[PDB]
């Protein structure tokens, strides 16, 4: 029962073999979830399930540099369901973030921000009950 939006500091940024795990339950009638891995004001990796964009469910990923969003990467596979508990695992690999939901691989997002050790906050927001947010080195 963490307060949302929730900031999880990532000390010394991210690095390959860091695993970030987010446990929560989606609210009933959800509209959105967002993970924002931030480098200061920049968003290195925005992971944004949208429950109703023109009556479709889509995961939007992007990067925000100097206040400008870049080119969206969209994933139609949509493992989240209103009302249901989920697990998001974000594994940093050398050339991308690797995301699994409920133990199933979902997507990868190539590193656009190169200074991984400056990506030192994760913001978790949206229509969830957040249970826990943590990290470990594997
Ligand atoms: O790219 C991620 C960001 O997308 C913004 O929405 C985009 C608008 C602006 O509303 O035009 C699109 O690119 C296509 O319709 C939208 O996806 C969101 O406002 C941001 O929060 C962020 O998700
Ligand atoms: Cl495009
Ligand atoms: Cl749903
Ligand atoms: Cl960079």
Swiss-Prot record:
Keywords for the protein's UniProt record, in alphabetical order: Acetylation, Cytoplasm, Differentiation, Disulfide bond, IgE-binding protein, Immunity, Innate immunity, Lectin, mRNA processing, mRNA splicing, Nucleus, Phosphoprotein, Repeat, Secreted, Spliceosome
Main location: cytoplasm
Galectin domain residues: 6-136
Gene Ontology CC, one term: extracellular space
Keyword Transmembrane: no
GO molecular function, one term: IgE binding
Phosphoserine modified-residue sites: 76
Compartment annotation: Cytoplasm; Nucleus; Secreted
GO BP terms, alphabetized: eosinophil chemotaxis; epithelial cell differentiation; innate immune response; macrophage chemotaxis; monocyte chemotaxis; mononuclear cell migration; mRNA processing; negative regulation of endocytosis
Tissue: A major expression is found in the colonic epithelium. It is also abundant in the activated macrophages. Expressed in fetal membranes.
Motif segment (Nuclear export signal): 114-129
Positions bound to a beta-D-galactoside: 69-75
UniProt keyword Repeat, yes or no: yes
Job of this protein: Galactose-specific lectin which binds IgE. May mediate with the alpha-3, beta-1 integrin the stimulation by CSPG4 of endothelial cells migration. Together with DMBT1, required for terminal differentiation of columnar epithelial cells during early embryogenesis. In the nucleus: acts as a pre-mRNA splicing factor. Involved in acute inflammatory responses including neutrophil activation and adhesion, chemoattraction of monocytes macrophages, opsonization of apoptotic neutrophils, and activation of mast cells.
Subunit structure: Probably forms homo- or heterodimers. Interacts with DMBT1. Interacts with CD6 and ALCAM. Forms a complex with the ITGA3, ITGB1 and CSPG4. Interacts with LGALS3BP, LYPD3, ZFTRAF1 and UACA. Interacts with TRIM16; this interaction mediates autophagy of damage endomembranes. Interacts with cargo receptor TMED10; the interaction mediates the translocation from the cytoplasm into the ERGIC (endoplasmic reticulum-Golgi intermediate compartment) and thereby secretion.
Protein name in the entry: Galectin-3
Classification of source organism: Eukaryota, Metazoa, Chordata, Craniata, Vertebrata
Name of the gene encoding the protein in the UniProt record: LGALS3
């Amino acid at each position: 029962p963490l307060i949302v939006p929730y900031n999880l500091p990532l000390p010394g940024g991210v690095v390959p073999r860091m695993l970030i795990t987010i446990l929560g339950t989606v609210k009933p009638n959800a509209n959105r979830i967002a993970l924002d891995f931030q480098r200061g004001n920049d968003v290195a990796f925005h992971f944004n399930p949208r429950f109703n964009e023109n009556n479709r469910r889509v995961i939007v990923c992007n990067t925000k540099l100097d206040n400008n969003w870049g080119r969206e990467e969209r994933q139609s596979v949509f493992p989240f369901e209103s009302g249901k508990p989920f697990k998001i695992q974000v594994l940093v690999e050398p050339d991308h973030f690797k995301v699994a939901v409920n133990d199933a691989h979902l997507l990868q997002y190539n590193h656009r921000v190169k200074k991984l050790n400056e990506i030192s906050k994760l913001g978790i927001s949206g229509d969830i009950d957040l249970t826990s947010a943590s990290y470990t080195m594997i």
